[PDB]
Amino acid sequence: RRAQKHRLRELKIQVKEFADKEEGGDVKAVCLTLFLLALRARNEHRQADELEAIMQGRGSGLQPAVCLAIRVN
DNA sequence: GATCTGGCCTGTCTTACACAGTGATACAGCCCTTAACAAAAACCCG
């Protein structure tokens, strides 16, 4: 952890200054879409969409009507 | 005894009587990227 901190502090300062100046310090959504598109580049739409969900926040499970629909159909 | 008539027996017909669901294969979309060139509102700027 400390290892990768050292390894990447240069990119850290780079991206933080550039994103803070560009969009007004909203590094959250900037880096969000950054990693989204970067991971989609290698055709990981599965992981990209589940990460879109995890950040969006929604429906980890199902509600009883849907489970009933499944075991009936 | 000859004859007229009904009963039985087959025989044709007309409606029904359970095939969608299995795995495997084949396409058909559909997005990512290179790089640039052009194009709807969104909006201050004049």
Side-chain angles (χ1 to χ4, degrees):
Chain A
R1 190 181 295 272
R2 179 67 175 86
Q4 64 185 357
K5 293 179 182 179
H6 185 277
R7 292 173 67 190
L8 298 174
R9 68 188 185 277
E10 295 84 3
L11 183 62
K12 292 182 177 67
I13 190 66
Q14 186 176 4
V15 66
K16 67 179 73 174
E17 66 182 1
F18 190 77
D20 290 331
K21 69 92 176 179
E22 180 65 27
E23 294 293 328
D26 189 359
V27 299
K28 185 176 180 180
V30 174
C31 304
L32 179 62
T33 64
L34 188 281
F35 179 73
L36 291 174
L37 296 175
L39 186 63
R40 294 180 185 272
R42 191 176 65 249
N43 295 115
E44 295 293 329
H45 296 283
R46 183 178 180 271
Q47 293 181 357
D49 288 331
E50 65 85 21
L51 192 153
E52 190 276 332
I54 193 169
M55 294 300 291
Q56 182 179 1
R58 61 178 291 167
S60 66
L62 296 175
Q63 70 275 18
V66 175
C67 294
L68 193 282
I70 292 172
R71 69 175 292 275
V72 175
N73 287 317

